[PDB]
Amino acid sequence: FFDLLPYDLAGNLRVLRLYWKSKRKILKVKSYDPETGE
Amino acid sequence: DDPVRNKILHPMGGVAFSYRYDIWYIGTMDQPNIFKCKIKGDNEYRGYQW
Amino acid sequence: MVISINQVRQLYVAKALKANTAALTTAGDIVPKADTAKTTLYFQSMSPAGIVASDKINLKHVLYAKATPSEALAHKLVRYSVTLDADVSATPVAGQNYILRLAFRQYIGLSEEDQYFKYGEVIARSGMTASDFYKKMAISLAKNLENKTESTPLVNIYLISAAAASTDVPVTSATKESDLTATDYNQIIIEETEQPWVLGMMPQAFIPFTPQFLTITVDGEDRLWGVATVVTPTKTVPDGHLIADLEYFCMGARGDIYRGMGYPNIIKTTYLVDPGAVYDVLDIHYFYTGSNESVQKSEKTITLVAVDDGSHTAMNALIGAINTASGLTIATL
Amino acid sequence: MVISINQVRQLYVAKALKANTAALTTAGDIVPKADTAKTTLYFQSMSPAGIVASDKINLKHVLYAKATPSEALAHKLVRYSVTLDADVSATPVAGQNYILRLAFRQYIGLSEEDQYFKYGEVIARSGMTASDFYKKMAISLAKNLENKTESTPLVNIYLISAAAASTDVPVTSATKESDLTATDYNQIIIEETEQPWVLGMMPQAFIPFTPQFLTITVDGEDRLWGVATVVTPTKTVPDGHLIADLEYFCMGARGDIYRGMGYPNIIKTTYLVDPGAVYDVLDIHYFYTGSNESVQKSEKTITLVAVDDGSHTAMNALIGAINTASGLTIATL
Known part of the structure; x- marks a missing residue:
């Protein structure tokens, strides 16, 4: 009683799982259909 | 023979703790004679003051 | 050498005593300055490239100020x-x-x-x-x-x-x-x-x-x-090699923390101690306290070093000038 | 402060003049040793880690020898x-x-x-x-x-x-x-x-x-x-800033050329020239010639600095010891 999280409680192991959104560079290209002019 | 903690040297060479003999278990007891202790659920402390 | 600190350790060399601010001419002198209301002691020194000061010792926030001789720091x-x-x-x-x-x-x-x-x-x-x-x-x-x-x-x-x-x-x-x-x-x-x-x-x-x-x-x-x-x-074994590595460490607070790391490009600190001379040490350990809810302490110390000649002449004059200016009872060694 | 050379140039500080090998006891002494036939002159000095000798100057092979006072190296x-x-x-x-x-x-x-x-x-x-x-x-x-x-x-x-x-x-x-x-x-x-x-x-x-x-x-x-x-x-401007740079260059012909470079992993030379004192320089220039086909010279030199006080007391005694030992005609200043 002072006024954190150990790694093993009771023979078990602390699995900290982090899910995060990184930022990925992509490219939007504009190509033409060969047969039709779209 | 740990020469840092054993600082008394024996007259017959080496540290004086090496000449100590210990028979830890005499026979079978059907229980642990010598063991370590814990408190049930005692998580070791880790706390920051920053 | 590398020593442990109580959150800082600053060293000043007392190669001479001058008793006034305008008399600091040679590098390595010291003048213990304090005001008449005994609230602040501080040390003006003549560094080899200018006049430096110490930190402002709050004279009520002092823990110990004990001066140690040259024979109590020699290895037998x-x-x-x-x-x-x-x-x-x-x-x-x-x-x-x-x-x-x-x-x-x-x-x-x-x-x-x-x-x-x-x-x-x-x-x-x-x-x-x-x-x-x-x-x-x-x-x-x-x-x-x-x-x-x-x-x-x-x-x-x-x-x-x-x-x-x-x-x-x-x-x-x-x-x-x-x-x-x-x-x-x-x-x-x-x-x-x-x-x-x-x-x-x-x-x-x-x-x-x-x-x-x-x-x-x-x-x-x-x-x-x-x-x-x-x-x-x-x-x-005399005290010259200990204080010369003690000044070499304590200059890193007021100066460069590296000393020669990278050698086209150093800031070459000129030292004042001689390693072939025996020295006396006075260590004034004081702290800091804010006058608020944060009464928590930030410990400091200032180590002064003066040359020993056998009768402790250069240190006993340094202690007495601190005694009358600041009002502390440092025991004369 | 890099200085050009004819060939290599070795400096030996002369803080004190002794008369025999056994008196060389502290860092900076010197003694000009020679034979009774005056066919070889050399200089024993006491470095911070032992007695070292210079190269052996064959006195038949001297080109010039001249001692320069302290005033001639002062920049007006x-x-x-x-x-x-x-x-x-x-x-x-x-x-x-x-x-x-x-x-x-x-x-x-x-x-x-x-x-x-x-x-x-x-x-x-x-x-x-x-x-x-x-x-x-x-x-x-x-x-x-x-x-x-x-x-x-x-x-x-x-x-x-x-x-x-x-x-x-x-x-x-x-x-x-x-x-x-x-x-x-x-x-x-x-x-x-x-x-x-x-x-x-x-x-x-x-x-x-x-x-x-x-x-x-x-x-x-x-x-x-x-x-x-x-x-x-x-x-x-006094001579102390030239000679403390002049000795630093000639302490790589004897000592290490990698001065401070990989900084913790060096050997460190103790330089025995005070940068705040004036000096007198004696330049002894000579060479070496081989036996039969190696008549080509290796024109090297040995220089000597000695601190003087007004009237050049230390240098004129050093010339006065070389002239009796080596038999040279080095003029006194």
Whole structure:
């Protein structure tokens, strides 16, 4: 009683799982259909 | 023979703790004679003051 | 060297005392300044490129201010009187091999698991007295421990005659049997020596040893041969190498934390201490407190260093100028 | 401060002259040893880690030997005396702009193509005499030049009272014209100053200048209002910054060439030349020639510095020991 999280409680192991959104560079290209002019 | 903690040297060479003999278990007891202790659920402390 | 701090340690060299601000001309002077309402002490020094000040000691926030002399910081070199055990045999018996083993414990590393073992050996003969035996073993150890090929100075060995009984005759790897002309040698004193010191890189530390003996089978029994009793020390290692590495560390707070790291490009701090001079140390340890809910303490210290001349003249004048200006009772050493 | 060589040049400091090998006991002694036939001269010195000898100078193969006093290596700081042009007007004309330009030539550069210019400006008044013009010009010159937020010191401004005529009145940025109280000023002494010095890294160099004036329209004609003549120099820079750089270069022919480079993993040479003391240099230049086909010379030299106090007491005893041992004719200074 002072006024954190150990790694093993009771023979078990602390699995900290982090899910995060990184930022990925992509490219939007504009190509033409060969047969039709779209 | 740990020469840092054993600082008394024996007259017959080496540290004086090496000449100590210990028979830890005499026979079978059907229980642990010598063991370590814990408190049930005692998580070791880790706390920051920053 | 690297020392531990109570959150800072600042050093100022007192090479002279000038008593006023406008008299600071030579580098290394000191003027302890304080106001008449005894609330703040601070130290103006003449650095080699300008006038510097100390931190402002709040005189009520002082914990201790004790000045230590030059003889309380000198390492005494421990000795060992190696003799023949009289209860085994007073005279050396003519058949056994007489070996002495010196057991070093911090030979190159810092641990006591980094050991070193050097030896000395004499084969004893008939007609060999106790004095002719100590004449044969101090040569055998000086050809082992005090040779010109050893990488580090380990120990210094001497012999003691019974006529003189106090003065040491040194034995090195050039001394012969005919140089030592005495029939009354009664002990072999092995003394610790001064290890090399390079400023800030190789600090003042020593290699300790413990003389251990082998057995002579005097009467069908492997009795130990000798007894090594520690004598009171005589030679001191002076305080010059400790304070020169202590100033070398404490300049890193007011200056560059690196000292030569990268060598087209250093800020070369000019030091004021001489490593061949013995010094007195006064260490004023004070702290900081905000006048609010945060009464929590930030400990500091200021180490002042003045030269010792044998009668503590340069430090006792430094203590008295702090005593009257600031109103503290530093004990005059 | 790298110096050119014919071939390699070894320096040996001479702090003290002893007469035999066994008296060489502390760092800096020297003794000129020679034979009874005077066919080989060499120098034993005591370094911080033992007695070393120089190369053996075959006295038949000497090219020149000359000892130089301390005054000949002192750089005379060049002074410029700025007066008003008497052909134009000895009194300041009312309402014209007096501007002075100082043309610095080697500022922060190794070439004369890196130039720097500092200005000082005075608009003259109606009752402005000659002394009041020199008063306000030296105020305006020192407010531009000798500001504390300048990287390197450039010149010093000195006023001359006509009643004094030999004492320089220093004008800095902190000086106001209230402190300049004389009523007879006839010139403005502008003198170059010492650039900063660290041994080995930064050489001893100086920045030159020439004071140049801008034209004033006096009687419809644009005339230069002043002249800039060079008086005989008064201050000298001492020899301690050259020799402490001269020894540092010759401590790589004997010692290590990698001085400090991989900084914790070095060998460190102790330099036995005080950078704040003057010295006298003796240059002993010689060579070596081979037996049959190797008649080509290896023109090397050994130099010797010795600290002198006014009258050169230490060097003239060192020449006095070489002349009896080697049989040379080195002239005394």
